[PDB]
Amino acid sequence: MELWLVRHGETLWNREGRLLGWTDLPLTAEGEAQARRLKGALPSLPAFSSDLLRARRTAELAGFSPRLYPELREIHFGALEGALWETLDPRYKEALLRFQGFHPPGGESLSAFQERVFRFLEGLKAPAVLFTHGGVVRAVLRALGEDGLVPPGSAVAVDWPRRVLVRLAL
Amino acid sequence: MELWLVRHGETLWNREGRLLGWTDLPLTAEGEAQARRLKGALPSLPAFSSDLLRARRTAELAGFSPRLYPELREIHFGALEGALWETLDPRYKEALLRFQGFHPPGGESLSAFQERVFRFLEGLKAPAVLFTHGGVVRAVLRALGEDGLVPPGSAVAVDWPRRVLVRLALD
Amino acid sequence: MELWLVRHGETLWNREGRLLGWTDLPLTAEGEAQARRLKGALPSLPAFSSDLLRARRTAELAGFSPRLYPELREIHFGALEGALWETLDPRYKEALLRFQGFHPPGGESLSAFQERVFRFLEGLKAPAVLFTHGGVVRAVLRALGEDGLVPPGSAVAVDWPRRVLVRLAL
Amino acid sequence: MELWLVRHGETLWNREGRLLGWTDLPLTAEGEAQARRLKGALPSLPAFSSDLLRARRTAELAGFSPRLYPELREIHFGALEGALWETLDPRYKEALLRFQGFHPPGGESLSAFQERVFRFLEGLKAPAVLFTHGGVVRAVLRALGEDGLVPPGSAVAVDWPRRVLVRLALD
């Protein structure tokens, strides 16, 4: 079943290199421009979106009116929200790189995060466009055996749960 | 899963251009003729149908004895039931044209409509013929990435939820 | 790759129950009606057709302008052209039923027929609509593990060479 | 196989509505701008291009160094080259609208055009970006069962010869 995974446009913490999870940052002017560019590429399938502002705004500027689901949110980094990637303790960096064994204080475990994401995906009943976050796109790509890193404002279409259909990076 | 969706025969509101949702209109003479032409053109599979008169009658004239499900009904237009498309407020026209963010007072939102329709389709255990409405066929075709407008009394077969197989219109 | 196999409309030998191969019979009025009905169902893909009149006319009435290929012709029945199926010698009937060991005098062997058909199919370079004959449609369906009998004026779409997509019988 | 087809930037005959085949017109200022916008929006894959100026220039401005193949050229309109679509004889208009039975005097038939294009695509060994023309993109999209009209300077990715993956238009 065709699903488009869209990573929201950039925020200030992207250029600053800070962990961005449930902190509700707005899009930068460039992030808004990235969202508008998606309007000329994304198919008009039923739309869903993380309820966080940056995702909702990306959906709006891309020409969609999404059903909001907190299950599409990025992982909750807890006390690590806003932490510089560069100065993250080695244990955290290593865990995020291997995508396992990450459970920041006051936040979500990577395992709980994946449970949440895949429960939502398995519940979908028709093709859809999903406005979400980097960690969510990464989890899905990794599940399909692919490298899960994608740029802000870009998207990847997948034939769930079989394979990747195409990547769209502008 | 192979599913054949049939848009019911025409009613008066088709030529008049009025939003037809849960208003239970009957088929016109031509609408019944369209339904009769479907007999022998549709596969012999289990059948389901919207419980609205125009759909049930199309199923009957097409040679089927469907199990009725309100879940296959057209979207509930609420206060917009019977409204001339021509005079619909821009916000509503746009919402219907782009098939998004539509929630008429006293009716169903497009999101609830899609959830209803797709939940019904997900529950089907095997290939079937579904006698339904223009909006239902549209939701399905659009979800499969194609233009969803089809003529009254016509059918479309799809491999749900993957691709459209064929569109069948008769003269 | 999507291929639509269309069996031409009926001729007089269909109701008469006679083997119809290279005998160039025209369509009956009903056969023409069957062809016109296909116009409202067949996709507008590149079209090819057997060069026999009944196939060409079906293509024309269905709204197509096909490239003609003798490779899409029904099997040449030789001396058996026009023979009543009912009175066919048991050996011939049995061979046609099992789809093997049929080589009428002055005609083509079923093996040579299949070679011709599949060589043409493997040569296709894009999806297409193929106006052809019962024996050809049967050969393709059997190759896909399905019963190959289809009514005159009907069609079957296949994802070559994997499986049948849908059958269209009016 | 993943293939990205790019319709070259606009030329004067786009706004004028004249059949543009082998007539070697240059890009307009806006056409070059459209080509520049493609840079960074197309994947880094081996590239091929029609040898006609407008296609080659689009490829260059998009950041590619394609191998040239006349096989990726637009159809040869023959005597109809430069003809206003508006005044085209009905037989020709119909042939082009229905994309069938088109054989202009001194030019290429649609059948020969398709054979040329599809033979070229069949020979591609791996994913690539193809800088080409409206008629080529149309032939491909139509063969995949979809409407084949796309804007100048836009692109479409397909999994050849199975389905369309995405259509990309930039403003």
How are the elements arranged and paired?
The structure is a homotetramer.
Chain A lengths: L1 E6 L4 H5 L12 H10 L8 E3 L3 H9 L5 E2 L21 H9 L11 H14 L4 E5 L1 H10 L11 E5 L3 E6 L2
Parallel strand pairs in A: 1-4, 2-3, 2-4
Antiparallel strand pairs in A: 1-5, 5-6
Helix pairs in contact in A: 2-3
Task: Characterize the structure shown.
Chains B, D: Substrate binds at residues 7-14, 54. Chains B, D: This is Alpha-ribazole-5'-phosphate phosphatase. Chains B, D: InterPro entries: His_Pase_superF_clade-1, His_PPase_superfam, PG/BPGM_mutase_AS, PGM_Phosphatase. Chain A is α/β, with parallel strands linked by helices. Chain A has a single domain, classed as 3-Layer(aba) Sandwich (Rossmann fold), CATH 3.40.50. Chain A has six helices and six strands; from the N terminus they run βααβαβααβαββ. The first copy, chain A, has helices spanning 12-16, 29-38, 53-61, 90-98, 110-123, 134-143, and strands at residues 2-7, 47-49, 67-68, 128-132, 155-159, 163-168. Chain A has a six-stranded mixed β-sheet with strand order 3-2-4-1-5-6. In chain A, β2, α3 and β3 (67-68) form a beta-alpha-beta unit.
Largest interface: A-B, 15 and 18 residues
Regarding quaternary structure, what we see is homotetramer
Radius of gyration of chain A: 15 Å
* CATH class descriptor of chain A: Alpha Beta
CATH topology of chain A: Rossmann fold
Strand content of chain A: 15-25%
